[PDB]
Every structure is written in C-alpha cells, then in structure tokens.
Design an enzyme around this catalytic site. Structure first.
Site, short mmCIF file in Angstrom:
data_model
loop_
_atom_site.label_atom_id
_atom_site.label_comp_id
_atom_site.label_asym_id
_atom_site.label_seq_id
_atom_site.Cartn_x
_atom_site.Cartn_y
_atom_site.Cartn_z
N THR A 128 -2.33 6.24 -22.38
CA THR A 128 -2.17 4.90 -21.86
C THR A 128 -0.70 4.53 -22.03
OG1 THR A 128 -2.84 4.00 -24.01
CG2 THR A 128 -4.53 4.17 -22.28
N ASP A 174 -5.15 13.79 -25.52
CA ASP A 174 -5.11 12.37 -25.22
C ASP A 174 -4.29 11.65 -26.30
OD1 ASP A 174 -5.53 9.66 -24.74
OD2 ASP A 174 -7.70 9.84 -24.49
N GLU A 186 -0.45 4.79 -0.91
CA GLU A 186 -1.22 6.01 -1.15
C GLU A 186 -0.34 7.23 -0.91
OE1 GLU A 186 -4.69 5.72 1.35
OE2 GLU A 186 -5.73 4.49 -0.12
N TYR A 194 0.84 -1.21 0.00
CA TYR A 194 0.00 0.00 0.00
C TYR A 194 0.87 1.25 0.00
CZ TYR A 194 -5.08 -0.21 -0.21
OH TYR A 194 -6.38 -0.29 -0.67
N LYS A 245 -0.22 1.08 -25.63
CA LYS A 245 -0.40 1.05 -27.09
C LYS A 245 0.96 1.16 -27.81
CE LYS A 245 -5.23 2.82 -26.71
NZ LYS A 245 -5.12 2.82 -25.24
N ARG A 280 -0.39 -2.38 -19.11
CA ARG A 280 -1.71 -1.77 -19.20
C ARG A 280 -1.93 -0.75 -18.07
NH1 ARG A 280 -5.63 -2.80 -22.71
NH2 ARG A 280 -4.29 -4.47 -23.51
C1 LIG Z 1 -13.14 -0.19 2.98
C2 LIG Z 1 -12.26 0.26 1.84
N1 LIG Z 1 -12.83 0.44 0.59
C3 LIG Z 1 -12.06 0.87 -0.48
C4 LIG Z 1 -10.70 1.10 -0.31
C5 LIG Z 1 -9.90 1.57 -1.50
O1 LIG Z 1 -9.32 0.52 -2.22
P1 LIG Z 1 -8.16 0.89 -3.29
O2 LIG Z 1 -6.96 1.40 -2.52
O3 LIG Z 1 -7.85 -0.38 -4.05
O4 LIG Z 1 -8.70 1.97 -4.21
C6 LIG Z 1 -10.10 0.91 0.95
C7 LIG Z 1 -8.62 1.17 1.13
N2 LIG Z 1 -8.08 1.03 2.24
C8 LIG Z 1 -6.80 1.61 2.64
C9 LIG Z 1 -6.28 0.89 3.87
O5 LIG Z 1 -7.09 0.36 4.63
O6 LIG Z 1 -5.09 0.97 4.20
C10 LIG Z 1 -6.88 3.12 2.93
C11 LIG Z 1 -7.75 3.45 4.15
O7 LIG Z 1 -7.39 3.84 1.79
C12 LIG Z 1 -10.90 0.49 2.03
O8 LIG Z 1 -10.33 0.30 3.26
C1 LIG Z 2 -7.36 7.75 -27.09
C2 LIG Z 2 -7.76 6.80 -25.99
N1 LIG Z 2 -7.82 7.26 -24.69
C3 LIG Z 2 -8.19 6.43 -23.65
C4 LIG Z 2 -8.47 5.09 -23.91
C5 LIG Z 2 -8.89 4.21 -22.75
O1 LIG Z 2 -7.80 3.54 -22.16
P1 LIG Z 2 -8.12 2.32 -21.16
O2 LIG Z 2 -8.73 1.20 -21.97
O3 LIG Z 2 -6.81 1.91 -20.53
O4 LIG Z 2 -9.11 2.81 -20.12
C6 LIG Z 2 -8.41 4.58 -25.22
C7 LIG Z 2 -8.74 3.13 -25.50
N2 LIG Z 2 -8.70 2.68 -26.65
C8 LIG Z 2 -9.35 1.45 -27.10
C9 LIG Z 2 -8.74 1.01 -28.42
O5 LIG Z 2 -8.24 1.87 -29.16
O6 LIG Z 2 -8.89 -0.14 -28.84
C10 LIG Z 2 -10.87 1.60 -27.26
C11 LIG Z 2 -11.26 2.57 -28.38
O7 LIG Z 2 -11.48 2.03 -26.04
C12 LIG Z 2 -8.05 5.46 -26.26
O8 LIG Z 2 -7.97 4.98 -27.55
#
Ligand SMILES: Cc1ncc(COP(=O)(O)O)c(CN[C@H](C(=O)O)[C@H](C)O)c1O
Ligand SMILES: Cc1ncc(COP(=O)(O)O)c(CN[C@H](C(=O)O)[C@H](C)O)c1O
Lengths: 405, 405
Positions: free
Chosen positions: A223, A197, A53, A51, A226, A232
């Site tokens: 991204t 973008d 953050e 973790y 690509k 990813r």
């Molecule tokens: C109960 C709860 N819900 C969501 C998240 C966020 O998840 P992610 O980090 O994948 O976006 C949390 C995260 N928890 C962290 C921790 O407990 O250390 C912190 C409080 O954000 C969570 O607890």
């Molecule tokens: C120009 C452009 N911006 C953002 C994204 C989305 O990225 P992610 O999938 O990681 O959320 C795309 C995605 N492109 C895909 C593709 O070209 O096949 C599709 C059109 O969503 C993008 O092209």
C-alpha cells in the site's frame, strides 16, 4: 476549503469534525499516518476527470500526454526508492495489488502458502471470507509459540508438504524483521514464486531500516498509505521479466480506469520519501517504537516477540487478564486509538482477542519523540491497570490532551 | 494550490498542463465529465488518513464516528436519487462494483449472459482478457444487424439455451434506451439474477431521462464519474434482501479499507444530482446529443442505430471509407477528443474499428448548447471529409479554439 462549505454544509461539517478528531486523539493504529498538504492537493486535482486506461505512451484514450508524465514520475521515483526494475502504480488498494499478483501467476484452486492469519498474516493472504481464500487453496506457516518469530523450518515443511505455486511473506501484525532471503531459499527449493507484501514496512524499507524484499521476491506488493506516508492505494514492484504480465493483470485484468489524481499523489509521496528528512523521519518511527516497547515493558506489559524491530508492537494482555476488546474500548474513552488484535496462539476469538496492536508512524509524523513515547506508555499503564477507576480515566484524558495540546 | 507548487514542481507542472488541456480541447469522450470544485475539495481532504474497514456503526476500527456520517450521507442520498433500498458506496471503481456482484452470486465457472462486447458490452461483461471472462463462462446477446437495437428475442434465446445464473444488461457504447422490463422478464423465465450496469447512463436515470433499472434488477452497478458527474469510483444498489451479501462481497470479500475521501466526494456529487439544476443539466446533455446526432447526419454521417436516446452516439465511418483509428487520430490533430470504437458487426479489428464514439456530458457541463452542437458537427464534417488538407485542419483548429475561447 472554499467551495465545499457553501455547496455541502453537511459533508463539510463531518469533514471538519474528522480533521479536529485527527488532531485531538493519540493515533496509534499501526497502519495509519498523516499525509502532507502537497499529497492531498494532488488528490484534490482535476486529474480525476481523465480516463486513462492502459499505460504511459500506450493508452486507449487520446490526450494522456500530461497524465503520462505524472504516472511515469510515480513509476520512476518508486523504482529509485526501492531499486525495482518495474513498478505498477495503478492498483486502487493493497487488496487490488495482491489480487493482481495472484491473477498473474495462479489459476483457480492453486495452492498458496501464507502467514497464519492469527499470527500476523493479512485477510488477503488466505481468509476464507476473502477472495484469496475462496479462489485459491491457502495453507499457513506459523511463528514459534515462545519467541513469536516466524518459524522458517515451519515455512519450509509446509512448502515441501503442500507444494504451493506461490509463497507469500509479510504481515499486518508482525513486529520483527522478516528474513526474505530464507523465504526465497525455501521458494527455490519447492519451485514456487515468492510474493512479499511489504504494505506495513514500505517506508522503513525505503529508508534502509528494514531489509529490502525487492532483490529476493518475484513480486513485491504494497500500500502507499502506511509507513510510506502516501495517499490511500496500492503498488506492485517486480523484475522486468514479469512487467508485461503484471501490467496486463491490473489492466485489462482486474481494474479499468486508474485514479490519475491518486497516482499524482503517489508521485508526490514518493518524492517526499526520496528526501533525506524522510530517512530521518523513518528512523524516528523505529526509534519511537523501540522506546514505546521498552516503556510499556517498564509498566509491566508483555509484548509479543519481546519487543519490536519495526514501527509496530503487539501487547499480550493475558497477564492483566484483559481482552484486546476491553483494552481498545477503555483506551477509546481517554482518546487513545488502538486496535484489538489476535496474538499468536490466542485463546480468544478474533472478535475478542488477547492483544492490542500499536504503531508509531502517525505520532512520529506529528513530531512526537522519545519523551512522548514514555508518557504514552505511562498513560496506557494508568488506564489498563485501573479500568474501573473513573478518576484514573479522567487523569489519562487530561494527560492525552496535554500531549496533543 | 499552495503547497504542491513548492513541494513538487515536476508534478505541479504536469497537473497544470492537464488543467489547461481540459479547457483547450473539445472533450467528446462519452465516459468523461468535469467535477465541481466542491467534489475535488472533498477528495483533497484529510479523510484519506482514516482506516475504516467495515460499514457505518459496524467498523473494525475506532474513531469512525465522523467518516460514518459521510458514508451514510452518501448511501442515503444515493437511495433517494435512485429509489434503491440499499446502497454500497465503497467500490473503488466500476470494475470493483461489477467484481463484487459477480463474487456475491456466482461460483467459478458459472454461466453469465452479457451484451456482445463488439456491440456495446463492457470489458467487465466477459472479456477473455478480463477477470470476468477468465473466472466465469460468458455468453453474449447481440443487437439487430440493421436497427442496431438490442435483439430481445436473441437475449431470450441465448438465456434459454445457455441457462445463465446471471444476465447482465447495460453498455459502454449503446446509444438507445435499454428495456429493463424485458431483461427481467427473460431473467424470470430462466431463473437467472439480473444485474444492470448503468455506469454510462446513471446521471440520466437520476434525472428521469432514462428508465430506472432499480425496480427491475436484483443488482444495479455503476461508476460515479460518467453522466453522474462525480468522483472516480463505483457503487452498487440492490434490494434489502441482498444488502448483507453485497456488503460482505465488498468487504471482507474483494476490498480492504475504503477511500473515505472519495466517498465524501461521492456524497457531494449525489447532493448535486439531487438539485433541480442537475435535472436541467441532464436534459441539456440528452438534448445536445440529439442535436449533435442530427447535425452529424446533416453533414452526411451515418450513426449506429440511426441516432441516440441518451448522452452518446456512434458514427459508422464506412460510408466515408475511414477507420475509427484514422478519425480519432486526425480529430486529435485539431483539438477534438473522441475514441475509436467498434460498431456492431464491425469488419475491422478492435485495434482499428469502423467507428468513433462521442458523448455530450462534458461539453454540456462547460455550458455548450444546441448552437455549439451544430458547430462541433460542422467541424467534424470539415475534418473527416478533408483528412488530406492541412488548410482544412488549420481552419478546424481555429474553429475549435473559437469554441473553447
Ligand atoms: C458500463 C461500464 N461499466 C464499468 C466500467 C468500468 O469502470 P472503471 O473504469 O471505473 O473500472 C466502464 C468503463 N468505461 C470506459 C469508458 O466508457 O470509456 C471503458 C469502456 O472501460 C463502463 O463503461
Ligand atoms: C499487509 C497488508 N496488505 C494489504 C492490506 C490491504 O490494503 P487495503 O486496505 O488498501 O486494501 C493491508 C491492510 N491492512 C489493514 C491494517 O493494517 O490496519 C488491515 C489489517 O486490513 C495489509 O496490512
């Protein structure tokens, strides 16, 4: 793999099928690529356990000294690659990178000007079934009906009429160079921020083969997977003046814990892109795309915009009286992966389309050159001009196998 | 690793430091764990190369036959694990899982009732610097000032007064069992949806050691990386009636391409959680937490709520006249990783706090038992009762080393 085969035969069997599939097919999906073994190893590391953050030296958890080094490597390498003043390497995806920029500069209901989705604009550039179109008021600029090049007078008129707070440039299916200078000129006229973008063209930008949006845009999103040929995920680049706000938008704004293992993989990919051989690779991508374009035109195909300046091309299939859907399906039967794609001013729905989108980044990574481009075009011609002939399709199938070994 | 050491010495050196750090320290961050080698291998797979927008059998890209098998394995295993009618395994994180549920049932400005952030509620449950608090109107329920147990009459009164469209239950720092039945009863009274964020307790739920929110909640969100001991990411569970809407919220709503390699890792983690030895592991987690709680009380520490029903505990440091920040810093000096954490009715700011949060999931994974819990408590006592003694801190340092080898 050592432990997965023993622990989970079902998952391993499916992964092994996927690995073999990636080798067997001619992969022409324009957004796809093949990452290095180094990139994958970084993703498969113990960094998933941490973790972290916050940001390097400014975390909300102890023990981040080493993941800090990793994230900083990613940020600094990205800044060298693109000449940006600040990088945020935490976005989980292109979706989240875009989301964070919108969150930074826009309030609910603000007007945004983006590329027409049916002309090459992305889902996250204002689709009414995407957060972008639901949360903000998107208006669109178009390409010229004949040249298929962005109409900059249309960008300007839409900007002056609608007074957007933000203009978005860049695309998921635009085969020509985008003039970022003109976008910034228009943005300046109407007092709008400019977001670029560059997801599709990021590797080309890194190799000096597409104009760099960084000096022109307030925010550049991308991204990492690509043309940049990384893991990813997403990334944001911006001027130092926006650094604090962008970082805060990602966290605590729209994400929680970053994927440190994926950030490690980003650093690796950026390291690779900084090498001379990546520049040579990227040139072959563009060279191959131009060769493929020319060879397809030789087969009698019409290309949107009359060709390509980048890694991607769009075939307008109307002259063959085929839909994109039909073409996609039949090419799938012979081992060629493309996607159906709306063309500008498409008479067909997005579920059907009049086009296929093709890109050379993946096949170039595999070592394909100009001769392979000619053969791919010849196979596509054979298939699409003989959709009713099983013997033609079997020949294509054999010719695809010959290319992939 | 074979290729990363050669390709990227800088990234490899940092990763190797992190690996060694994870072994050397006593890791007590309540949200952390150590994933299996199988889980990491799945994350380090070629599945990162595949664009797979959409869902199994309903993708917007060809060639998804095998990644479909992987995602379906993840969904089905999750459904067996939690007895849910539908699973969405695509959320990139806990943040995005929560975001998608909010996007599904709420409009901008809708009222939501969540747990007071200073009493254990998460950032994504209404922080004014998080999308949740900016996009929706969050109100809060509290715990009793003495028992530190959720005041269900307060949940009810807040719900009846504010008429939220959604009630959120679950926490990042709540050491007792949550009564999901009472939450649903209150939700039903006021015509609100109930969302349970079980991120922290998901592994315990899977092992039958915490009541399952699935039969009570319209939506259950979770991370895959805490007590569930999986890869970093999110998941949504819901009744069949909401399946289509939830899936559409994730894509095309708030994400793009899913991380198929991470979804593979999710499937692996779910496979592990379905095994008998995971149930034994989860019991040891709770047993260890109770033992650690008792041993800390033996040292003279006051615990928020007077102990624990789960994997986590909160020390109220006011009797020792220490802040959480001071405790966190000094424990870091001896190789014990905790976080400072606000306690209910904390007189200190969130930047300082009067508490530390501790969890046993990580140390249990490493094989620590009750005897180790006693020793960890004794070391914490030694350190926090002798913050000014370098000799005490060096003894603690040596005792930590003895525990980790
Ligand atoms: C109960 C709860 N819900 C969501 C998240 C966020 O998840 P992610 O980090 O994948 O976006 C949390 C995260 N928890 C962290 C921790 O407990 O250390 C912190 C409080 O954000 C969570 O607890
Ligand atoms: C120009 C452009 N911006 C953002 C994204 C989305 O990225 P992610 O999938 O990681 O959320 C795309 C995605 N492109 C895909 C593709 O070209 O096949 C599709 C059109 O969503 C993008 O092209």
């Amino acid at each position: 793999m050592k432990y997965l085969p023993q622990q989970d035969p079902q998952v391993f069997a499916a992964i092994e099928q996927e690995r073999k599939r990636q080798h067997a097919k001619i992969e022409l999906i324009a957004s796809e690529n093949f990452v290095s073994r180094a990139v994958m190893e970084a993703q498969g590391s113990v960094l998933t356990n941490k973790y972290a953050e916050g940001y390097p030296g400014r975390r909300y958890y102890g023990g981040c000294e080493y993941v800090d080094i990793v994230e900083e490597l990613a940020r600094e390498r990205a800044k060298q690659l693109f000449g940006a003043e600040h990088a945020n390497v935490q976005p989980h995806s292109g979706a989240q990178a875009n989301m964070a920029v919108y969150f930074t500069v826009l309030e609910h209901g603000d007007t945004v000007l983006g590329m027409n989705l049916s002309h090459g604009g992305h889902l996250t550039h204002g689709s009414p079934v995407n957060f972008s179109g639901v949360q903000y008021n998107f208006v669109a600029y178009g390409v010229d009906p004949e040249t298929h090049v962005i109409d900059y007078d249309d960008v300007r008129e839409k900007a002056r009429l609608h007074r957007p707070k933000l203009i978005v440039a860049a695309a998921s299916a635009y085969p020509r160079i985008i003039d970022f200078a003109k976008f910034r000129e228009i943005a300046d006229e109407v007092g709008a921020y400019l977001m670029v973008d560059m997801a599709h063209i990021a590797g080309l930008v890194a190799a000096g083969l597409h104009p760099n949006p960084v000096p022109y845009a307030h925010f550049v999103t991308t991204t990492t997977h690509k043309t940049l040929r990384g893991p990813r995920g997403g990334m944001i680049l911006c001027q130092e003046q926006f650094a604090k706000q962008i970082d805060k938008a990602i966290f605590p704004g729209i994400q929680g814990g970053p994927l440190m293992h994926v950030i490690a993989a980003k650093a690796v990919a950026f390291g690779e892109a900084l090498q001379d051989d990546f520049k040579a690779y990227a040139k072959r991508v563009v060279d191959n795309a131009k060769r493929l374009a020319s060879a397809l035109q030789n087969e009698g195909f019409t290309l949107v915009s009359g060709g390509t300046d980048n890694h991607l091309l769009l075939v307008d299939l109307r002259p063959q009286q085929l839909t994109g859907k039909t073409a996609e399906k039949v090419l799938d039967e012979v081992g060629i992966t493309v996607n159906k794609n709306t063309i500008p001013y498409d008479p067909e729905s997005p579920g059907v389309t009049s086009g296929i989108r093709i890109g050379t980044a993946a096949v170039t990574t595999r070592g394909f050159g100009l001769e392979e481009m000619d053969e791919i075009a010849a196979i596509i011609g054979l298939v699409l001009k003989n959709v009713g002939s099983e013997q033609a399709l079997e020949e294509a199938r054999q010719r695809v196998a010959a290319l992939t070994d």
